[PDB]
Structure formats: structure tokens, C-alpha cells
Amino acid sequence: AEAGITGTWYNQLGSTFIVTAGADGALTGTYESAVGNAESRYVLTGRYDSAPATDGSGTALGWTVAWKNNYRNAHSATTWSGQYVGGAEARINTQWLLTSGTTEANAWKSTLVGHDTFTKVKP
Amino acid sequence: AEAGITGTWYNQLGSTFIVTAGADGALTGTYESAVGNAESRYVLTGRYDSAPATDGSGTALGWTVAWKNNYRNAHSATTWSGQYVGGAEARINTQWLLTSGTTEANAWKSTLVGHDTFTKV
Amino acid sequence: AEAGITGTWYNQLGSTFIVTAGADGALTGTYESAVGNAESRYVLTGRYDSAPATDGSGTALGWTVAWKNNYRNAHSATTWSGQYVGGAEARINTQWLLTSGTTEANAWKSTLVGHDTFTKVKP
Amino acid sequence: AEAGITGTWYNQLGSTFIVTAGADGALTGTYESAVGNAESRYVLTGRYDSAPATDGSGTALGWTVAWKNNYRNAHSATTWSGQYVGGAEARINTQWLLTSGTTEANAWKSTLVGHDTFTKV
Ligand SMILES: O=C(O)CCCC[C@@H]1SC[C@@H]2NC(=O)N[C@@H]21
Ligand SMILES: O=C(O)CCCC[C@@H]1SC[C@@H]2NC(=O)N[C@@H]21
Ligand SMILES: O=C(O)CCCC[C@@H]1SC[C@@H]2NC(=O)N[C@@H]21
Ligand SMILES: O=C(O)CCCC[C@@H]1SC[C@@H]2NC(=O)N[C@@H]21
């Protein structure tokens, strides 16, 4: 649900995710990573599927971060795809793809794959 | 580097991707899939890394589509991560993750992975 | 190391992995899954990279299971790619790809991706 | 279904895959990669699901290569998961995972994902 998703979240690496979910299925915010060629905050945009099902199914969603801001430019972008599971201990479980810009010759090694679990800090 | 990302692209399944790239890294537009539990257009939002880097590399980017619109709601979302290579034949080469909302019991099989190549042809 | 890998392992879903690592970099055994279109044991074969590094790096390895035996035929195969981290609480952390045989038309939805963590039962 | 899997296949990077399929689901052979920290041949072992199923589907299979031989040891392993489609032009369409051994600190970036298509041409 938008209200359930809106908030501050942290994952197992110690990275920060601040997001706002709008009535139209939109997600906007900033992300701070604890690892990598990154520093300060980066803007993020995504979408969430606003009418889930009733039942004890998760809400599917996804968002993107291009790793460029006023301080660093890493020439990469990461996308996270997953589901939001609410309750008293709400979580967002995801799998992600991190693509770096390469020459055609090294494109075979341009994408890393992983998984992150986020915990909401409420309050 | 960045540049002719704006436009109408098509992939090997016959899907249509219409996007506008803003000067500060944002991507907005609509997507229509030729397959799956989907019909008509859906809203997409993403980001690209303008630099990009001299050693003729691609420009990294990504975007998301939540499969809900006024015709269907498939309770899923797809994210595409890849890079744009411009030139005579411009291409956007991606890998995607399609997650459906499931119950805990079925969470082990909630995500499909695949790859799509887009051209303006 | 071969001795460190050889044994019985279980993952978060409650599935069983029995393996033997040979001196030549080989892995052979049986796998029993707690979920899916599966029943009884299935044969597995894989390889492990025998001379890791000294250091506190993991040993990379991978194995495959075709889901066909005398009782069921699911027309699928799963491959697990990951690393073995030994110590007192040894673990094998992986990401997997499960491909089902399809017609050309539905090949776009033939592969599922996930991650499993295995814990060794010693003794 | 299964059948002409045995043989010498090549993918879009120019790598060579030589395999033998046994009648009870086993796959054995050698692999030579045209890219990366690798040279000469490496041992591979895998499995395929013989049934396969009537609705002209592919045969599911997978195999593993640990990148260590008498010339190099790259401390990594790759697994390919996909399906074989025979016929006039037979193809093995796969997605792979390449994991390198890292320390805990770098475990978040230990795995690359990609896709390869093999032909006997
Ligand atoms: O190094 C880069 O290219 C930019 C930083 C990438 C950080 C990644 S995104 C996935 C994983 N989850 C995190 O919170 N950080 C790393
Ligand atoms: O069935 C669904 O869940 C919604 C439609 C999904 C269509 C997918 S997204 C990845 C692949 N590329 C496309 O153009 N369409 C399919
Ligand atoms: O349903 C099938 O096609 C065969 C069973 C698949 C079981 C999978 S493999 C990955 C995940 N890990 C497990 O232990 N079980 C599921
Ligand atoms: O550099 C390494 O770690 C060892 C060589 C890896 C070569 C990879 S495996 C997937 C892709 N397909 C190939 O034919 N070669 C590359």
C-alpha cells in the first residue's frame, strides 16, 4: 500500500532508502549505498502495482538509481525488482541487476546480480 | 554517450517502448507488451547515467513498469537494466526481472529473468 | 576444500543436498527438494574450483539437477552457482536458474531466478 | 526432445563447447572460452531432462565449468541453464551465472549474469 511503502528503509549492507509512494502507482526518493563507487545521495524513481490482491500476497514493485550526482559519476545503474510484505515487521524482498557501461568487447561482463532485503524503520 | 535515447523502440517480441530522456538523467514514457497478461499502454519511469564515460562505452540506464492500468492488473512489475549504444544502428541491450506478488509459500518461484534487445526498427 | 564440501547440507526451504567432492574438482550426489513438481531423490553432478586462494575467500562451485527420476519427470533443470565458506559454521551461498522446456512462443518465461543458502549438518 | 545434443557447438563470443549426452540424462565434455581469464580446455559436467515433453518444446539442461586447469586457476565457476531445440537449425539458448570466490566484504559483487546462444555453425 502507498502508506505502508512510504518511509525510511535499511538493508543488510547498511544502505539507506527514503521513498514516497504516490496515489498513481509512483515511487520517488533518494538512496545512499554503503558500498561501491558511490558517495552522498542519488535520486530514485520507480512504480508499484497500487491495487495488490487480499490476500496475504505481496505488492510487486521496482525502482532505479543511475549512479551519478554532483560528487561522483560511476557510469552504472542498478534496478531492484521485488515485493512489499507489510505487517508489524514490514519487509521489501528484492533481486537486483547492476549494469556498468562497457565497450562492445566487454559487454559479456557488464552485469552483476544480487539480492537485498530491506527493513522499515518505523518510527 | 547519451543522446538519441528519446524515441520509439521495439524489441524481439514486438513490444513498443516510447521514451523521453530529460537533460538531468530522467526517463519517462509508455510501454506496450506483445506477450503476457497485459494490454494497451502502461506508464514507465527510469534513470540513465549521463557521462557516460571516451573509451566508446554504452550509457547505463534502467526503468520500471508496474503492470496495472485501466484494462488489467497483473500484480507484477518488471525492471530492465542495460546500456544504450548509439551510432548508425542504435541498440539498448537489457536483462530484466519480472516479479509477481505471491504468498510466502510461493515466494521461491516469484521471479522470472530474461533479456531483451531494442532497436528503432 | 573437498573434505569441507563433502557431507549433508539443508537450505531454508527444507531441501536436502548430499555430496561427495573428488580430488579432481568433481562433485557428485543426490538432491531432494521440499517444494515443486518433485518427489524422491534426483542425481546431481558439478565441479568446484580444488585450489581456492589463502585467504578468507570462498571456493567457487556449481552443480546441476535435471528433474527426472523413476517417479516423476518435470521437464526442467536447475543450476546453482555460488561459494563455499568453511569454518565452524560452514555455508554454501548460491543464486540459481530454473529453466523449464517450452515452445518458442513461451520461451520468454522459461527461467526463474532465486537464491539459496545451505547449512552443513556436521555431525 | 533430446537427440543431437552430442557434438561441437559455438556461441556468439566464439567459445567452443564439445559434449556427449549419455542415454540416462548425463552430459560430459570440454569447454574453451574465447574471453576472460581462461586458456585452453576445461572439464564440464551436467544433466539434461529426457522427455522432454508432444507440444514441440525444448529439452531442459544445464552444466558447470570450474575455471581451473593446468594453465590457469581463475577461482571462479560458471553454470549455464537453458534448453535445446533441435531441427534444421539446432540451438541451445542459455542464461549463466559466473561466481568468483571473494571475501565476505566483497560478496555483494561476486556474481555476473549473462546469456549465450550456441549453434553447430
Ligand atoms: O559501484 C557502483 O557502481 C555504484 C554503487 C552500487 C551499490 C550497489 S547497488 C546493489 C547493492 N546494494 C546496495 O545497497 N549497494 C550495492
Ligand atoms: O504477464 C505479466 O505479468 C505482464 C506482462 C509481462 C511482459 C514481459 S516483461 C519482460 C518481457 N519483455 C516484454 O516486452 N514483455 C515481456
Ligand atoms: O518444480 C520443478 O521444476 C522441480 C523442482 C524445483 C525445486 C527448486 S530448485 C530451486 C529451489 N530450491 C529448492 O531446494 N527447491 C526449489
Ligand atoms: O574470467 C573468468 O573468470 C573465466 C572465464 C569466464 C568466461 C565466461 S563464462 C560465460 C561467458 N561465456 C563464455 O563463453 N565465456 C564467458
Residue in chain C nearest D59 by alpha carbon: C101
Q: Cα D47 to chain center, whole Å? A: 11
H or E element at residue C42 = strand C42-48
Contact flag C112-B112 (C-beta cutoff 8 Å): yes
Q: What is the DSSP string of D23-55?
A: TTSEEEEEEE-SSSS--S-EEEEEEE-S-----
In contact, A34 and A14? CB cutoff 8 Å: yes
* Cell numbers at D94, concatenated: 542459455
Contact status, residue D112 vs residue A106, Cβ threshold 8 Å = no
Residue C52 preceded by cis peptide, ω within 30: no
Beta-strand pair C42-48/C59-68: antiparallel
In sequence order, which residues have a C-beta less than 8 Å from that of residue A11 and are 6 or more positions away? A17, A116, A117, A118, A119
Q: Taking a C-beta distance cutoff of 8 angstroms, is the pair D48, D25 a contact?
A: yes
DSSP code, position A90:
-
Q: CA-to-CA distance for A49 and B1, rounded, in angstroms? A: 32
Give the domain CATH number at C45.
2.40.128.30
Question: Hey, what's the cell of D62?
Answer: 544445464
Closest ligand to the CA of B108: 3
Q: Scan for cell 520509439, then name that residue.
A: B8
With a Cβ cut-off of 6 Å, ligand 2 is lined by: B 11, 13, 15, 33, 35-38, 67, 74, 76, 78, 96, 98, 114, 116; C 108
Q: How far apart are CA C56 and CA C26, in angstroms?
A: 22
Q: In this structure, what C-alpha cell is assigned to residue B64?
A: 520500471
Give CA–CA dist C27/C118, Å, rounded.
16
C42 labelled ligand-binding = yes
SS3 state of residue C44: strand
Nearest to A109 by CA among B47, D33, D46, D41: D33
Please confirm whether the linkage preceding C123 is cis (ω < 30° from 0). yes
Say if CB B82 and CB A99 are below 8 A apart.
yes
C29 touches C16 (CB < 8 A): no
Helix, strand and coil in chain A, % to nearest 5: 5, 55, 40
C23 touches chain B (CB under 8 A): no
CA of C40 to the centre of ligand 1 (A): 40
Place of cell 531494442: B118
Q: Contact, C96 vs B109, CB < 8 A?
A: no
What is the rounded distance in angstroms from the CA atom of residue C65 to the CA atom of residue C96? 11
User: What is the Cα–Cα distance from D65 to D78, expressed in whole angstroms?
Assistant: 6
> B32 is in which domain, residue-wise?
1-121
Which of C20, C16, C18 lies closest to C2 in space, CA to CA? Answer: C20
Burial grade of A118 (CB within 10 A; 0-12, 13-18, 19 or more): buried
Burial class for A6, CB neighbours closer than 10 Å (0-12, 13-18, 19+):
middle
Q: Is B24 exposed, middle or buried (0-12, 13-18, 19+ CB in 10 A)?
A: exposed
A111, A97 Cβ separation under 8 angstroms = yes
List CB contacts (< 8 A) between B79 and chain A.
Answer: 62-64, 79-81, 97
Residue D96, annotated ligand binder? yes
* Distance (Å, whole) CA A44 – CA A5: 14
Cβ-contact C24, C40 below 8 angstroms? no
Residues 6 or more apart whose Cβ sits within 8 Å of residue D73: C49, C51, D67
Longest Cα–Cα distance of chain A, Å, equals: 49
CA distances from A60 to A3, B7, B32 (A): 15, 28, 19
- Write out the DSSP string of chain B: --STTSEEEEETT--EEEEEE-TTSEEEEEEE-SSSS--S-EEEEEEE-S------PPEEEEEEEEEESSS-EEEEEEEEEEEEE-SSS-EEEEEEEEEE---GGGGGG-EEEEEEEEE--
Q: Does D73 touch chain C (CB under 8 A)?
A: yes
Sign of CA dihedral D25, D29, D33, D34: negative
Q: How many CB atoms lie within 10 A of CB B37?
A: 12
Chains that touch C (3 or more CB pairs under 8 A): A, B, D
Give the separation between CA D46 and CA D22, rounded to whole angstroms: 11
Strands D91-100 and B7-11: unpaired
C-alpha angle with apex C57: C55 to C60, nearest 5 degrees?
135
User: Quick count: other Cβ atoms within 10 Å of Cβ C81?
Assistant: 29
CA distances from A55 to A2, A6, A85, B102 (A): 17, 21, 11, 9
Cβ(A24)–Cβ(A50) below 8 Å:
yes
Say whether C5 sits in a helix, a strand or coil.
helix
Helix (H) or strand (E) holding A16: strand A16-21
Among B8, B15, B71, say which to mutate for ligand 2: greatest number of ligand atoms within 8 Å of CB. Answer: B15
CB pairs under 8 A, 24+ apart, for C34-41?
C35/B108, C36/B109, C36/C67, C36/C74, C37/C67, C37/C72, C37/C74, C37/C76, C38/C67, C38/C72, C38/C74, C39/C69, C39/C71, C39/C72, C40/C69, C40/C70, C40/C71, C40/C72, C41/C69
Number of domains within chain D: 1
Pull the grid cell for residue B108. 521461491
CA distances from D12 to B20, B31, D26, D27 (A): 32, 29, 25, 22
Long-range contacts of C89-92 (CB under 8 A, 24+ apart): C89/C119, C90/C4, C90/C119, C90/C120, C90/C122, C91/C117, C91/C118, C91/C119, C91/C120, C92/C5, C92/C9, C92/C61, C92/C117, C92/C118, C92/C120
Whole-number Å distance between alpha carbons of D96 and D89: 22
What letter does residue C23 receive in the DSSP assignment? Answer: T
For the record, the C-alpha cell of B13 comes out as 517480441
Which method, experimentally, gave rise to this model? X-ray
C-alpha–C-alpha distance, residues A27 and C85, integer Å = 38
Residue A111 and residue A98 in contact, taking contact as beta carbons nearer than 8 Å: yes
Closest CA to D112 of A57, A98, B118: A98
In whole angstroms, give the CA distance from residue D116 to residue A108: 9
Rounded (10°) CA dihedral B8, B11, B16, B22: -40
Which of B35, B38, B27 shows the shortest CA–CA distance to B64?
B27
CA D24 – CA A54 distance, rounded (Å): 46
Q: How far apart, in whole angstroms, are the C-alpha atoms of residue D78 and residue D90?
A: 23
Q: Is C13–B111 a contact, with Cβ atoms under 8 angstroms apart?
A: no
How far is residue C99's CA from residue C77's CA, in Å, rounded to a whole number? 6
